[PDB]
Ligand binder design. Structure first.
Ligand SMILES: NC[C@@H]1O[C@H](O[C@H]2[C@@H](O)[C@H](O[C@@H]3[C@@H](O)[C@H](N)C[C@H](N)[C@H]3O[C@H]3O[C@H](CO)[C@@H](O)[C@H](O)[C@H]3N)O[C@@H]2CO)[C@H](N)[C@@H](O)[C@@H]1O
Ligand SMILES: [Mg+2]
Ligand SMILES: [Mg+2]
Ligand SMILES: [Mg+2]
Ligand SMILES: [Mg+2]
Ligand SMILES: [Mg+2]
Ligand SMILES: [Mg+2]
Ligand SMILES: [Mg+2]
Ligand SMILES: [Mg+2]
Ligand SMILES: [Mg+2]
Ligand SMILES: [Mg+2]
Ligand SMILES: [Mg+2]
Ligand SMILES: [Mg+2]
Ligand SMILES: [Mg+2]
Ligand SMILES: [Mg+2]
Ligand SMILES: [Mg+2]
Ligand SMILES: [Mg+2]
Ligand SMILES: [Mg+2]
Ligand SMILES: [Mg+2]
Ligand SMILES: [Mg+2]
Ligand SMILES: [Mg+2]
Ligand SMILES: [Mg+2]
Ligand SMILES: [Mg+2]
Ligand SMILES: [Mg+2]
Ligand SMILES: [Mg+2]
Ligand SMILES: [Mg+2]
Ligand SMILES: [Mg+2]
Ligand SMILES: [Mg+2]
Ligand SMILES: [Mg+2]
Ligand SMILES: [Mg+2]
Ligand SMILES: [Mg+2]
Ligand SMILES: [Mg+2]
Ligand SMILES: [Mg+2]
Ligand SMILES: [Mg+2]
Ligand SMILES: [Mg+2]
Ligand SMILES: [Mg+2]
Ligand SMILES: [Mg+2]
Ligand SMILES: [Mg+2]
Ligand SMILES: [Mg+2]
Ligand SMILES: [Mg+2]
Ligand SMILES: [Mg+2]
Ligand SMILES: [Mg+2]
Ligand SMILES: [Mg+2]
Ligand SMILES: [Mg+2]
Ligand SMILES: [Mg+2]
Ligand SMILES: [Mg+2]
Ligand SMILES: [Mg+2]
Ligand SMILES: [Mg+2]
Ligand SMILES: [Mg+2]
Ligand SMILES: [Mg+2]
Ligand SMILES: [Mg+2]
Ligand SMILES: [Mg+2]
Ligand SMILES: [Mg+2]
Ligand SMILES: [Mg+2]
Ligand SMILES: [Mg+2]
Ligand SMILES: [Mg+2]
Ligand SMILES: [Mg+2]
Ligand SMILES: [Mg+2]
Ligand SMILES: [Mg+2]
Ligand SMILES: [Mg+2]
Ligand SMILES: [Mg+2]
Ligand SMILES: [Mg+2]
Ligand SMILES: [Mg+2]
Ligand SMILES: [Mg+2]
Ligand SMILES: [Mg+2]
Ligand SMILES: [Mg+2]
Ligand SMILES: [Mg+2]
Ligand SMILES: [Mg+2]
Ligand SMILES: [Mg+2]
Ligand SMILES: [Mg+2]
Ligand SMILES: [Mg+2]
Ligand SMILES: [Mg+2]
Ligand SMILES: [Mg+2]
Ligand SMILES: [Mg+2]
Ligand SMILES: [Mg+2]
Ligand SMILES: [Mg+2]
Ligand SMILES: [Mg+2]
Ligand SMILES: [Mg+2]
Ligand SMILES: [Mg+2]
Ligand SMILES: [Mg+2]
Ligand SMILES: [Mg+2]
Ligand SMILES: [Mg+2]
Ligand SMILES: [Mg+2]
Ligand SMILES: [Mg+2]
Ligand SMILES: [Mg+2]
Ligand SMILES: [Mg+2]
Ligand SMILES: [Mg+2]
Ligand SMILES: [Mg+2]
Ligand SMILES: [Mg+2]
Ligand SMILES: [Mg+2]
Ligand SMILES: [Mg+2]
Ligand SMILES: [Mg+2]
Ligand SMILES: [Mg+2]
Ligand SMILES: [Mg+2]
Ligand SMILES: [Mg+2]
Ligand SMILES: [Mg+2]
Ligand SMILES: [Mg+2]
Ligand SMILES: [Mg+2]
Ligand SMILES: [Mg+2]
Ligand SMILES: [Mg+2]
Ligand SMILES: [Mg+2]
Ligand SMILES: [Mg+2]
Ligand SMILES: [Mg+2]
Ligand SMILES: [Mg+2]
Ligand SMILES: [Mg+2]
Ligand SMILES: [Mg+2]
Ligand SMILES: [Mg+2]
Ligand SMILES: [Mg+2]
Ligand SMILES: [Mg+2]
Ligand SMILES: [Mg+2]
Ligand SMILES: [Mg+2]
Ligand SMILES: [Mg+2]
Ligand SMILES: [Mg+2]
Lengths: 49, 272
RNA sequence: GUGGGAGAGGGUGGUGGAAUUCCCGGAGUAGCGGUGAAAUGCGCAGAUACCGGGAGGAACGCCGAUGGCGAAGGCAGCCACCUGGUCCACCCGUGACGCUGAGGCGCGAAAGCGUGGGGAGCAAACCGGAUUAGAUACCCGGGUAGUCCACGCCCUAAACG
RNA sequence: CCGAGGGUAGGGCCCGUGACUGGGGCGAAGUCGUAACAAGGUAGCUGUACCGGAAGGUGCGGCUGGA
RNA sequence: CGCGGGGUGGAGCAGCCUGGUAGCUCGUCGGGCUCAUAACCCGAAGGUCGUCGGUUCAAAUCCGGCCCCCGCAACCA
RNA sequence: GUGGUUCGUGGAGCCAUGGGGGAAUCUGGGCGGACCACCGCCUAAGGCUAAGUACUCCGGGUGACCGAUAGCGCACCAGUA
RNA sequence: CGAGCUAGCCCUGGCCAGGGUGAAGCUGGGGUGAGACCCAGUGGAGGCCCGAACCGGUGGGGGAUGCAAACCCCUCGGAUG
RNA sequence: CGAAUGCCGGCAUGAGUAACGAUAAAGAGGGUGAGAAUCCCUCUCGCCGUAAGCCCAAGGGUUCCUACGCAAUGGUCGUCAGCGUAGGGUUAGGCGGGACCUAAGGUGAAGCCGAAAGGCGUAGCCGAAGGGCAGCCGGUUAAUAUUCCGGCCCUUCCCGCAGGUGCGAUGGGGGGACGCUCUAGGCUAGGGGGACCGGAGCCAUGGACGAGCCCGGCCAGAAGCGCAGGGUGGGAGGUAGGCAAAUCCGCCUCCCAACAAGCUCUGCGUGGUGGGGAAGCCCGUACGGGUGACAACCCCCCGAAGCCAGGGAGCCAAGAAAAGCCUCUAAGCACAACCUGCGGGAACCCGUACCGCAAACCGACACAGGUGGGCGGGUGCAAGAGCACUCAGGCGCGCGGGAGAACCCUCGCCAAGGAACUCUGCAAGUUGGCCCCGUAACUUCGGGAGAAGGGGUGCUCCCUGGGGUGAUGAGCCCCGGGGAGCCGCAGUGAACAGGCUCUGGCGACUGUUUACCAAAAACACAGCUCUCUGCGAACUCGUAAGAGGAGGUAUAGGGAGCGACGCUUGCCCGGUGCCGGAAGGUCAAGGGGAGGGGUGCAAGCCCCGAACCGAAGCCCCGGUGAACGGCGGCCGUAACUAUAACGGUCCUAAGGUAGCGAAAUUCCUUGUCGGGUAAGUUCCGACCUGCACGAAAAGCGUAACGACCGGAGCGCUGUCUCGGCGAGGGACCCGGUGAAAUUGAACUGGCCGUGAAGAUGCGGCCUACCCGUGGCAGGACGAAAAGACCCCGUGGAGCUUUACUGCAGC
RNA sequence: UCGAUGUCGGCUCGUCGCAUCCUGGGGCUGAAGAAGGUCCCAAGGGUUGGGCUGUUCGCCCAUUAAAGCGGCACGCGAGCU
């Protein structure tokens, strides 16, 4: 039947986006750590135009 | 009135509709004086505070005039009488001679063509509005104010009305659609007559949908759910509450009074 | 036809005071209530009795009658509107247009019923108190529908002269 | 084609029968109480309404076939 | 089988738990009123207290053994 | 009414303080574990101050530390696939 | 950290083949004092009917290291709300 | 280190075993090639065809095209590919999105709140498949085209000249601007026919040179007409309203029209012109190109759900916003500015490849699954997006070859019987569309109803009534009627297409739910009652602000229960709850100091502390049951027995009423009578001795309705007696690829014993050459899951309450 | 035996014991004969279809020579239900 992953570019940047994470105190920390851990990608790689 | 139906479908037998004869060939509302976008929504910021709402026909707000000392002395002619989805009372639209249009909740009687007005002057006739003092003790009246300049608030439901009782200082005793004798200030307007369309209390919704149309989702009894989400809940085949009847949140609901005790509004009240 | 007569005939609208019950204020105490007698009941939390104010519902005292009105049921404070039957005088108009009347049809007390409004008094059911062998009764104290209004039903009667 | 009659399907009236059940009539001396006829010891009778072992009681209106 | 409740004049109930004292309503018997019966009035009678044991000076009453009676439990499989 | 100190309301001070009350300028004030007298000690309601102390992303040195299943998760284009 | 599954609501758009049934209402006819009302014709109502898409998921069989961590065949519910 | 269902790594066992992923289907010829069932081409066959075809959106991100290539990826092969390597390929003022607008929502100056983080938030900003905005048809590449070329046609902008006008706002007013169902008129899309026109071509096999077969007979298109249609009255005075000002709008009054006459604005024809243009035939593809060709390019009929569109009518549940747009004036400006022409110049940023019901997206997979909008031809069946075949177009599902066992799956049929099957007619059958006769109880008058039960259905010929389009006609297309006759076993001849009834339980009804074992009698539902709430309402979320409630106001909103409707819902307020009690009793902090203590020489300073004053709550006084609930026991009596209307008596707060009652409630229990049956632990009707019904945790009924649950009969049947045969997919054998759970090691028989009491393994005896393949499931206490039951642990959670103790709240 | 020995019934398949239901022998019989009663010998084979119940068992219904009773993990769920 229908599954749980229904990709959607908008929803994805809108939710796990970078400006998205900067906006909140908890998300900014999410960035810190990922930066502090090394992670090549701080946030998901949404795309297209 | 109240239209009836032959049983050509169970439900549309007991079903009963209103009679919109009193509706002056109007229907399409009046831009300008209303309508405004009406933000429908069953909960506040986030959560749902009143339960069981949502869904139900889209609606446009008819921005009515609920404080008439706006036009003291300026007479206006009642133009139409139309339907208002936001209330039980039908409403009358009227053109002042000032050239301004505005709606008023329509009183029983008031016919299209009639002239109506407000102010200390104003003749005591259906439609006219005046400060409570200047109104004849005993006359009935609707659309009362509670405090001078704050707008109408009592007897505005379909065909409801309040009767003046006496005077007493800068105050005048009323008798609200509920039976409470209240002391209102003299300077509160109150347009004379009863609200009209009193057949409203007689409409037999009819089916399940009918309720759904007016935006009210099904209502489930506490008795149906479990202990986790309401007092009356569980365990076997039905069961007699098992304690003093209570609400989802738990306070008694078969008798417990609510008005907050030490309210300042107490002293101006006298009844039930 | 013409000109008059009495009437609680009928419908809507409006209104008057008396009484009642209830609330508030007052003053006032030690009992009121009820009965054949009592008790139940009510009452120092302050009754009953009396004054003052207000609320509300119903029913209209004397007039009033062994009276009037109506086809019956029935109809009663008072004001108006809308309206029905009927009596008289005049003998002027039509000119036999009449009597009854299966059916249909309407009207039809009280009780009851439907939806809604109203609720003071009273009052089936009901609860208590006495009476009683026993009382599901006649007496008493509480009391619900109902009694009241609107529309719709009901159609019965010792609807009896 | 018509057609006696037969077959299948469903109806209309009628009669018989049916555990059980509703009142009813009749049946010399059983139980319970007082409803009625004398003001029947609560005038009765009454249409209706509810209640009660039972007569019956009670509200409401009514009638004299009562004061 | 198990839990606890109960056997009292003819009927239905008290009386114990703080042992010595059996009480109430009806019914039954005798007498009255009535023509007579009921009602009502006046008096009177009737109880090995389920039984076999002992506990104490003394048991309806305290304690164990059985005879019926009533109610409650007989769950997980 | 509470927190701090070893102090859990204890004879409960001292130090901070939300609430109510509400002084004084040396013959003034707080303290020395309820209190009071004595004897003393210090001078609240403003602020600044290196140093000796902590840490080790980073540089260097040394190891009765590991030696590729160990040693960092990664000796290797690993916070990757 | 999650409402890209799911639940509910808010905003803005889309979809529902074809056939049944025939409400009110109008029109006329009868009918009365005027009514009620009875007829036709018209009309096109409805959590109305048969039934696709579409939404379900009733019974049975299959499948059970499957085609599939919910599927397949037959059958069946709804389908202008 | 041998153990931890240990950790990691490797290799074994099962096994050449199961499998190789839809029963839509394959055969051959010729190529290419180291190597062909698997690649290319041709012929024949099969499958889809409201898709298995094509157009979009999403998502994916090079998968597109072309060259060379098969190591690996492909469930086999591979010369092939979505795979490897290389290079190439995606063109825009007009399609989409941005230099336009607003929706919910997001953000947020101001303001408010919060220990901090942060929460709120009218202005504005942000936010789109919604509003607005200018491209149609053809030609080209191996791959792009509403993009490039071609032909016609638009749009803003800036600068000019020519001419008009009070010009001018982020501001005023207009409009934009709206539901649902049903719809008319006239068009277009698309489609059927043509004796007419255009075409290579063809007489086959008995007949046909025929008004024969086969093929095709359009597409875009400015202005102007034309046919449809959508919008809109023109004046002139008065003005105190549209938070300034308006000449605008609005309202009042006097005129002239009420018409669309007139102005507009779309659509559709037609239009200068511009294109396109089959079958066949010839070739060479991996494909497309020539010719057919000066191709014709005409006439009917069907006809939308699409266009005219802001059309109409009906209804109730009463149906976004803002810009652009027109108009209005203000500040300013009127040498500006703006409008109409006409020239010339400027017109930016991003998407375009390809897959797109799928081998390219979501499911670890080249997965029988999920996936949103448009088109979706023909015929036939009553209609249709249905069904059967077929256009176009795309496919034969990336293992094959044989065999013809049992057994399984899917399918077909059957003598006689037909439900004897079984927990149950579970399953399968019969029934089946439309037309016409014809239909009971009951009923809330609609329904029950497709009730039941019947008959008709094909084709040919004759006669004959109505429409539509054309003219009042032929034709083409629609509905009909009557009458003769024909062929089969059979005419909705295949495909799609209810078995019927009788009677109980429950629920009134449509609905809803345990995604992934329960779809129900459960939830919901209209409706009935209680109750809270006077509005800064109650209530809910929040520390607050704040909001919701509600831009509501008692005819309304919250909570509770019952659950259409019919007829009804009885008694008890003792206990608990809630409601009413300016008495009294109790009642903390606080007031108050009687009186007492500690130090002081002391004045003083520090404590204890009784009177009495002291809230709510509790107590007590009252009511309240559609509030929490409760609604008895034992003895006796009627003139046959019986039985008890009657009576006695004990304790209640009162002491179950009507109605129903072997029940979804009945233990004893197949209670006992009656009915159905040859027979009835069920079923239906009764009786009542109701373990243990009973009135809004409703009672008793109820027409209609249900994939709900029980009984019965008819019909039909492979359910059964009782099987049998046939079919295809596997199973079997051959070729290719090649798993798995399990596994202390194994050289693993039977019996009677024995053993921790169920032995291949120990004892005795019996049997028994070694190793396989198709099968069966009796055993290995077989596999699977550290039993889900039970107990244990002073283990853990969810739930409850007059358990304790706190807390929010009041 | 709880690091699992799946459990009532039925169905399919059976096998065994005899303390035998039938049939076959036999002794006594209060056994005339026919039919029986009873014990003894003896399992070789046979041991029906139904209605009710989940049912085991019963109860019936129509027959029968008879309508036997038990074990095999209340035999048999890696065989079904
Ligand atoms: N025929 C009388 C009708 O039935 C009823 O009456 C019947 C009964 O009430 C009545 O019973 C009576 C009883 O009332 C009275 N107080 C005592 C008497 N012994 C009984 O008598 C009855 O039984 C006996 C013996 O069997 C018979 O012989 C006698 O005929 C019969 N009446 O007997 C009557 C039948 O005979 C109605 N009450 C009466 O109004 C009505 O008219
Ligand atoms: Mg938020
Ligand atoms: Mg509910
Ligand atoms: Mg539940
Ligand atoms: Mg709870
Ligand atoms: Mg409960
Ligand atoms: Mg229960
Ligand atoms: Mg004369
Ligand atoms: Mg007459
Ligand atoms: Mg009456
Ligand atoms: Mg009433
Ligand atoms: Mg009263
Ligand atoms: Mg009274
Ligand atoms: Mg009385
Ligand atoms: Mg007496
Ligand atoms: Mg009457
Ligand atoms: Mg009668
Ligand atoms: Mg009379
Ligand atoms: Mg009979
Ligand atoms: Mg009969
Ligand atoms: Mg009889
Ligand atoms: Mg008497
Ligand atoms: Mg009497
Ligand atoms: Mg009578
Ligand atoms: Mg009475
Ligand atoms: Mg501390
Ligand atoms: Mg101090
Ligand atoms: Mg010190
Ligand atoms: Mg010091
Ligand atoms: Mg410092
Ligand atoms: Mg390592
Ligand atoms: Mg590592
Ligand atoms: Mg009609
Ligand atoms: Mg319809
Ligand atoms: Mg429907
Ligand atoms: Mg359907
Ligand atoms: Mg070891
Ligand atoms: Mg094997
Ligand atoms: Mg094999
Ligand atoms: Mg195989
Ligand atoms: Mg690539
Ligand atoms: Mg390719
Ligand atoms: Mg390969
Ligand atoms: Mg594969
Ligand atoms: Mg090659
Ligand atoms: Mg914006
Ligand atoms: Mg947009
Ligand atoms: Mg565009
Ligand atoms: Mg392409
Ligand atoms: Mg201007
Ligand atoms: Mg403007
Ligand atoms: Mg504007
Ligand atoms: Mg030939
Ligand atoms: Mg051909
Ligand atoms: Mg053209
Ligand atoms: Mg319209
Ligand atoms: Mg607007
Ligand atoms: Mg804007
Ligand atoms: Mg730019
Ligand atoms: Mg492109
Ligand atoms: Mg493309
Ligand atoms: Mg594949
Ligand atoms: Mg879909
Ligand atoms: Mg189509
Ligand atoms: Mg199809
Ligand atoms: Mg057969
Ligand atoms: Mg046959
Ligand atoms: Mg059977
Ligand atoms: Mg059987
Ligand atoms: Mg059955
Ligand atoms: Mg079936
Ligand atoms: Mg049934
Ligand atoms: Mg049923
Ligand atoms: Mg239902
Ligand atoms: Mg669902
Ligand atoms: Mg489920
Ligand atoms: Mg299911
Ligand atoms: Mg309410
Ligand atoms: Mg909130
Ligand atoms: Mg608010
Ligand atoms: Mg609001
Ligand atoms: Mg319910
Ligand atoms: Mg009750
Ligand atoms: Mg109480
Ligand atoms: Mg009580
Ligand atoms: Mg009480
Ligand atoms: Mg107090
Ligand atoms: Mg029975
Ligand atoms: Mg019971
Ligand atoms: Mg019940
Ligand atoms: Mg109840
Ligand atoms: Mg119910
Ligand atoms: Mg019932
Ligand atoms: Mg349903
Ligand atoms: Mg269902
Ligand atoms: Mg078979
Ligand atoms: Mg085969
Ligand atoms: Mg052994
Ligand atoms: Mg051995
Ligand atoms: Mg085995
Ligand atoms: Mg096997
Ligand atoms: Mg095992
Ligand atoms: Mg374990
Ligand atoms: Mg258990
Ligand atoms: Mg413990
Ligand atoms: Mg175990
Ligand atoms: Mg094991
Ligand atoms: Mg013998
Ligand atoms: Mg056996
Ligand atoms: Mg056993
Ligand atoms: Mg057993
Ligand atoms: Mg067994
Ligand atoms: Mg099994």
């Amino acid at each position: 039947m229908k599954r749980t992953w229904q990709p959607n570019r908008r929803k994805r940047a809108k939710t796990h986006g970078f400006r998205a994470r900067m906006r909140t105190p908890g998300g900014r920390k999410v960035l810190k750590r990922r930066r502090q851990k090394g992670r090549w990608r701080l946030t998901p790689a949404v795309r297209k135009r | 009135a109240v239209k009836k139906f032959k049983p050509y479908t169970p439900s549309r037998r007991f079903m009963t509709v209103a009679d919109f004869s009193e509706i002056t060939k109007t229907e399409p509302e009046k831009s300008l004086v209303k309508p405004l976008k009406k933000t429908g929504g069953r909960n506040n910021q986030g959560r749902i505070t009143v339960r069981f709402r949502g869904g139900g026909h889209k609606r446009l707000y008819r921005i009515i005039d609920f404080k008439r000392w706006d036009k003291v002395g300026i007479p206006a002619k009642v133009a139409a009488i139309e339907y208002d989805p936001n209330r039980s009372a039908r409403i009358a639209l009227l053109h002042y001679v000032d050239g301004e249009k505005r709606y008023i909740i329509a009183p029983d009687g008031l016919q299209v063509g009639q002239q109506v007005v407000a102010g200390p002057d104003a003749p005591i006739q259906v439609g006219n509005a005046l400060p409570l003092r200047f109104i004849p003790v005993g006359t009935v009246v609707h659309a009362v104010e509670l405090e001078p300049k704050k707008g109408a608030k009592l007897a505005r439901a379909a065909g409801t009305s309040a009767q003046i009782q006496g005077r007493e200082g800068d105050y005048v005793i009323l008798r609200l659609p509920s039976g409470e004798l209240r002391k209102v200030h003299g300077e509160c307007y109150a347009t004379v007559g009863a609200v009209g369309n009193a057949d409203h209390k007689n409409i037999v919704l009819g089916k399940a949908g009918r309720s759904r149309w007016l935006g009210r989702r099904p209502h489930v009894r506490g008795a149906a759910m479990n202990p986790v989400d309401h007092p009356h809940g569980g365990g076997e085949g039905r069961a007699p509450r098992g304690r003093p009847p209570a609400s989802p949140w738990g306070w008694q609901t078969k008798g417990l009074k609510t008005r907050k005790r030490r309210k300042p509004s107490s002293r101006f009240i006298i009844a039930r």
